[PDB]
């Protein structure tokens, strides 16, 4: 586990030095040009399981200093959508901008970036015993990308998440979360999504991820977004440590190269 940052000396263009996979040709994130997407006519329809159930109070949130992570304590499954088997949810991470809903997503569609991108990571439990096992076996995991877009009104479905962020302002803080409905953190219409093969968007940047990217965004008000802009981290140099806003925590987009993006 090498040190890495989103900017400066250990920023994205330096990642390859300590994690050579970060210089790969199947990296994530990407811009999705819809008119170049192939229509996946062979897809079995996306099936979600457990997404409608209230999350347990053992579910918790952490400020890792690079993102805010949610460690899921319930069984959630996704299958179909050209995914190789049935995948189980492990955790959630977020990426956001700077202020006033400025671009913060990792992916984009037709060049449009979004104020927040939420990512849910999955493993196939039929092949591996845990998410950690799947990572260390270095073969294949699943990931969902969800965009948020500014809305004039608060999205009440987000309340436990926003309240969570209020409670993890500093690097390494942790809090338990009020119950939430994971389905309600997904777009209202799951109809349009994209599929492509890619990688982790942080070191070690392993090219093992089957990505689902939903086209339609989830609403979030400017008032709720402020909870994201109120997250801090620390930056530690040779002889200074400082408390800083955690902002623009996204990786630059990567070339498609030989890859084609598919769409529902």
């Amino acid at each position: 586990d090498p040190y890495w940052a989103y900017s400066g000396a250990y920023g994205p263009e330096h990642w390859v030095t300590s994690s050579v996979s970060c210089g790969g040709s199947h990296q994530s994130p990407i811009d999705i040009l819809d008119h170049h997407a192939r229509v996946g006519d062979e897809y079995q329809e996306l099936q979600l399981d457990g997404f409608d159930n209230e999350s347990s109070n053992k579910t918790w949130m952490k400020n890792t200093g690079k993102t805010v992570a949610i460690l899921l304590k319930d069984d959630y499954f996704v299958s179909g959508a050209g995914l190789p088997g049935r995948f189980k949810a492990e955790k959630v991470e977020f990426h956001w901008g700077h202020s006033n809903g400025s671009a913060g997503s990792e992916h984009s569609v037709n060049g449009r970036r979004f104020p927040v991108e939420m990512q849910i990571f999955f493993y196939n439990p039929d092949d591996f015993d845990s998410f950690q096992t799947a990572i260390s076996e270095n073969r294949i995991i699943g990931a969902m990308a969800i965009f948020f877009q500014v809305s004039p009104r608060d999205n009440s479905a987000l309340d436990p998440i926003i309240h969570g962020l209020k409670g993890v302002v500093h690097h390494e803080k942790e809090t338990f979360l009020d119950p939430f409905i994971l389905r309600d953190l997904l777009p209202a219409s799951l109809g349009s999504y994209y599929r492509y093969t890619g990688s982790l968007t942080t070191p070690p940047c392993s090219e093992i991820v089957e990505w689902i990217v939903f086209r339609r965004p989830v609403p979030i008000s400017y008032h709720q977004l402020e909870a994201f802009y109120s997250i801090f981290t620390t930056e530690q140099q040779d002889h200074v440590k400082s408390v800083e806003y955690l902002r623009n925590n996204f990786r630059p987009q990567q070339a498609l190269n030989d890859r084609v993006v598919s769409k529902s």
């Binding site: 302002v169 801090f232 040779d238 002889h239 200074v240 440590k241 400082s242 408390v243």
Partner: protein, 199 residues
């Protein structure tokens, strides 16, 4: 057996920070053997911070902490390291501190940057020193509490704006859970630990 080398670095990177921002300057003392003590200079004069809750020098870590930086902090800092056993002192490189002009840092809850261990074995009649200091805007206040809510024995010594709680002549009734609270208008955080008596 006791020694300390000269610092190797001639000059340190300029520190650029926002007015209102919390910053820690790291001493980084050179190789040595023996217990070290610490002071910091500011523009070629010693820093007099022991009645100022905004700035703290830790004799444990050696570092200089700015709970929040003000325009008056702008200048050159060095860390001055004394090795008492070695009868030798060495001065660190000049460290420029400058304010950014991008705007000021907002208010935010305290973050504890120096604390005491979660478990401490405390020998009878020994002296136990606990430190706690936080960065934050407004400048945080540090207070201390026994979890059992009992008043502190008179022997306890508070110093440096309560950044330091010392427990002399440690007795069995002194053992138990302690916590320091770092608080301001935007919120509060704590550090807790258990002191465990042995003889």
């Amino acid at each position: 057996s006791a020694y300390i080398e000269d610092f190797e670095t001639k000059t340190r990177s300029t520190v650029s920070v926002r007015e209102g921002q919390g910053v820690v300057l790291l001493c980084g003392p050179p190789p040595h053997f023996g217990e070290l003590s610490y002071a910091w200079t500011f523009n070629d004069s010693p820093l007099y911070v022991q009645e100022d809750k905004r700035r703290f020098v830790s004799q444990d870590t050696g570092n200089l902490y700015f709970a929040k930086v003000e325009p008056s902090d702008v200048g050159n800092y060095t860390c001055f390291v004394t090795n008492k056993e070695a009868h030798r002192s060495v001065q660190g490189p000049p460290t420029p501190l400058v304010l950014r002009t991008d705007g000021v840092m907002g208010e935010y809850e305290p973050k504890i940057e120096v604390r005491f261990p979660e478990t401490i074995q405390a020998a009878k009649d020994s002296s136990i020193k606990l430190e706690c200091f936080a960065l934050g805007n407004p400048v945080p206040d540090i207070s201390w509490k026994r979890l059992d809510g009992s008043p502190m024995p008179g022997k306890i010594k508070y110093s440096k704006s309560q950044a330091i709680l010392e427990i002399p002549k440690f007795q069995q009734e002194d053992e138990g859970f302690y916590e320091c609270i770092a608080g301001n208008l935007r919120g509060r955080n704590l550090a807790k630990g258990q002191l465990i008596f042995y003889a």
